[PDB]
Structure formats: C-alpha cells, structure tokens
Amino acid sequence: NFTQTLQKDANASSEFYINKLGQTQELEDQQTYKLLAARVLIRENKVEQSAALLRELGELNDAQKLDRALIEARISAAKNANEVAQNQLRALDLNKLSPSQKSRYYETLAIVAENRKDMIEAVKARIEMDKNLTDVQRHQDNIDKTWALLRSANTGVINNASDEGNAALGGWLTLIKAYNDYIRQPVQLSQALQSWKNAYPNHAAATLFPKELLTLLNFQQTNVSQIGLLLPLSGDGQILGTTIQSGFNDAKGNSTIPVQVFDTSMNSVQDIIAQAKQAGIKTLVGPLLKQNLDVILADPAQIQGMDVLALNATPNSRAIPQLCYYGLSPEDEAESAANKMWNDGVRNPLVAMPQNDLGQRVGNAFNVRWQQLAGTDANIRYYNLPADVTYFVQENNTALYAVASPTELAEMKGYLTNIVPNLAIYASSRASASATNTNTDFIAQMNGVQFSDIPFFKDTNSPQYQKLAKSTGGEYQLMRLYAMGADAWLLINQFNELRQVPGYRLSGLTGILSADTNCNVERDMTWYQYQDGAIVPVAN
C-alpha cells in the first residue's frame, strides 16, 4: 500500500525521505523512500546523488522497477544521453502510469527535445504534461517553461507551424506569433493578448498566463504630461547640465509637453522632489551627480507616485519601482568590451584598470559579464603608472582591455611593442579625443587598436554632426553629454515600455538602449578601429 506513494507527487525534501529510512523497517518501504529521494534529488540539480542513490537500491517489486526507470531516463536526459533516455521510456507501459508519473514521463521527453534544440516537440511534450498535473504551482511552472521554449524557437518554424488539429498547440502558436509580430509595438500586442484570452478561453494559459506576459496583457503607453529636469546649471558642472540640456531641448523639438527645470546647484534634491509633487509633476529626468541620486536612494519613498529617469548610477543603485538609471557609465563600455572581445575569439584577456574607485567598479562590471560569456574570472589588474602593464604581460605571453587616457594608452602600446607588438588592444571611449584623432602620428601608432564610443560618431559629415562639433569646441565629452540628453527625451517618453516590455530596445544617439532587471539602462556600444590612418566602425 505504501508503494502507491510513488504514483503521487513528491513534495518533501530529499533529506526528509532519506531520514525516514532509520525508522523504516520493511525492505520494500526502504526502497520506496530511496526512489522518492532520487526523484527529488534531480529537482535539486543533484544528478550524481540521484544516480548514486539509485545504485543503493536492491531488489524491487514491479511498481518500484517502473518508477526507477522514470528516474533513470530523467537522469539520462540530464546527462544528454538522449537516445538512451528515449529507449528507457519506450520500454515503459504508458498505461500503467499514474497522472503524476505521466507528468514526469513527458517532462523528460521535453528535456530531450529541448536538448536537441527541437523546440516544437518540446512544447508538444509539455502539453501532455499539463494534462496530468494537479498542483496549481506546478501548472504555472509548466506554462512558464512552455512559454520559454516558444520564445527561443526559430521565428520561421513558428509562423508556418501547424497546430495539427491540437487546440492546445493552436493557442500556444497563436500566442507566440502575436508576441514576435508586435513586441516592437507593445500597445498593439496588448490588444492581441486580450483578443487571445477571448479566442482560446479554455486554454490552460487563458487561466494561468505566463509571468512574462502579465505586464503585457494590460500594458499602457507612457502618457507624459509634465516633466521636471534636475541638472546642475550654475556654478559647478554648469557645462555638464547645460550641454545635457541642449541635447534634451533639441531632441524635444516643438513638443507641447511642459518641462520644468530644477537647478540642483542652487536647490536641494529633496526640496526639488517635494516641489515637483506640489506642481503635479509625475515625471523627472535626473539628477545627474551620484551624490544627488543617492539622496533619492537614501529614501525611495520620496518619489512615490512618479516615473524618474535618473541620469547616473551608484553602488546603492537597486531595483526601485518607477526608477531607472541611465548614465554614460564606464561599466557599460566594459560590459560591451567583454562582449566584443568574446565574439572576436578572445579568451582569458588582460584587463588594465586604474587603481582608483572608478577602476574597481568597471573591472567588476567587466568580469561579471565575462563570467557570463566565459564562465571564468578574467585577469583584472590595476595600474598606477601606464608602465606597470609591462610586468602584467611579462607574467605570460592574447588580448588587452585598458581604460586610460588617449596618451596613457599610447604609452602602454609603445611599452609593449618590444614585448608583444601583435597584441589586440581594446579601449573605452576615454581613449578617443579630438586632439589625438586629428593627428596621423597618433592614428598611425595606434593601427589595430579599437575602442568603444557612441554610434553618433559614425557620421562626421552630417549637418547634425557639423553643427555640434563646432558648437562644443571639439571636445568629445560635451558631444556625448549632448547625445545623452537627446536619448533622455527618447527614454523618458518610452519609460513604461522600458520597465514592462522584455528585451525592449531603442536606437539612440548613445547606442542601442535597453534595460536589465534593476531597470539599469544598458548600452550596446559602437566599436571603432584605427585602420591605415582611418577610424572605421567595426561593430554596431
């Protein structure tokens, strides 16, 4: 009678079923607890202990022999023994299984199909799984997994895919087809989803909508009525806030949206926020300085009832409702460098950061991203003199990423030409200045070096570019601040899209803009390379 426990869901921990052995007297009942533990051990990502415990099993009755083979095949699928896993499940009598056992049976199939990148068959497997589930939370997990398979499936296979008279598969295919067809237009996709829940009302997902789509069902376009602009426009950083203001205004154009300017150099940020609340302003851009942003982070409740696009990021930056961080951050240029370098074939690179507070953060943003692509920690080394790079290379003889001045970067390579002259050098936008990109003696010495910078510098002939280069006096920093202000107008009008729409992307003057889980605005950088006396865009 206790063997029948196998036919049900196993909701306890592995330690629970294993510890019951000391109290379990009968031999069959000891084996049952062993199988229940092995079943849960897989759900705990402990495959070896599951296979190991299976090796402790002795003599089993037929009901146990059956449950073991389920756990055997699931292990095989975990270890990518796809042909083995399937043959192990072809040997079972699918009629002898309970609903819970059929659920585990078809989940293993879905993993084999997913292992083989065969997404449609993996979805078909999870539909049969859903028919045998009883726990609501397990239902939701199957639906969340099912949605993830469709979202990774090739877009062509989905458009031409037939539902094969299968209503379940029909509703799934139509749902993903709407997602891919209108994800760039969320307002339109919201109408499609609401239509979907009336088209397939008895669909399992009509009741338990996948998590990724709940924010999209009743999505609402940003309706900016009033903006408050927090920038330093007097005293210190005046040029920063004024040039940023120039970009914001020029990108705003003939918009009726009233903007109220708040000068942080002459007013407290907590007083500004209070006055904004008083004037009925529900949308802010800024502040710019890290310290002033931390005033918000020192008490997030201040911005209760507002959408705020802060223009910087701090170590205290974190997930805060209706708060998103958008700064010309070196962490982004390092995260982009980790990507560029990886896609180019670089493995285990040397990273040269300055031994200051800014260098540690950027190195951490670099490595964390590198842990994603490489699964390893990179060589982050901190330099006090550009000449210290020599010993870093003298350790072993490859690609370098360095954050340094345009001249500091020229010293580094010169020190390395005798040591390793054919080294692939990557740098951040800090290595790009007007005084140096106009002189071929610098452009020639830097042949092969590539750096990240905003895509605005691709077109140095456009009238748009013309007017700005002469207006800023030829200083790239003032030109990037102008680009940020402009992209802030793009971003603050796409604010709700940014928080609610997965993978949302925007082509702005500062790069391809998107958001992470902490609504930190990421930037996909443009990469430029010095080639035979010219600077050409290599990527993006």
For 255-269, the DSSP string reads: ----EEEEETTSS-H
227-325 CATH fold: Rossmann fold (3.40.50)
Q: Phi, psi at residue 71, to the nearest 5°?
A: -65, -35
- The experimental method is X-ray
The answer to whether residues 501 and 216 touch, using CB atoms and an 8 Å cutoff, is yes
Residue 230: closest CA among 252, 260, 275, 251? 260
Q: Is 198 exposed, middle or buried (0-12, 13-18, 19+ CB in 10 A)?
A: exposed
Pairing of strands 283-285, 450-453: unpaired
Which tokens go with 427?
Answer: 């740098």
Resolution in A: 2.6
Which tokens go with 149?
Answer: 């398979």
306 alpha-carbon distance from chain centroid: 25
Helices (H), 162-237: 167-182, 186-199, 204-207, 211-217
Residue 354's DSSP bridge partners are 383
Question: How far apart are alpha carbons 218 and 325 in whole angstroms?
Answer: 25
Residue 332: closest CA among 525, 478, 177, 192? 525
**Alpha carbons within 13 A on the beta-carbon side of 23:** 5
**Alpha carbons within 13 A on the beta-carbon side of 194:** 12
Helix (H) / strand (E) element for 103: namely helix 99-115
Helix (H) / strand (E) element for 494: namely none
Residue 244: closest CA among 474, 509, 513? 509
> Does residue 287 have a cis peptide bond before it, meaning omega lies within 30 degrees of 0?
yes
Question: How far apart are alpha carbons 33 and 12 in whole angstroms?
Answer: 11
Count Cβ atoms below 10 Å from residue 260 Cβ, excluding itself.
Answer: 15
Under DSSP, the state recorded for 320 is: B
The answer to whether residues 336 and 324 touch, using CB atoms and an 8 Å cutoff, is no
Question: How far apart are alpha carbons 268 and 245 in whole angstroms?
Answer: 19
Task: Give the SS3 label for residue 44.
Answer: coil
What is the distance in angstroms between the CA of the first residue and the CA of the last residue of the chain? 65
Task: Give the SS3 label for residue 20.
Answer: coil
Which tokens go with 274?
Answer: 């209070």
Question: How far apart are alpha carbons 248 and 269 in whole angstroms?
Answer: 20
Residue 345: closest CA among 365, 374, 377? 374
Pairing of strands 450-453, 379-383: unpaired
**E-state strands within 369-471:** 379-383, 399-402, 424-427, 450-453
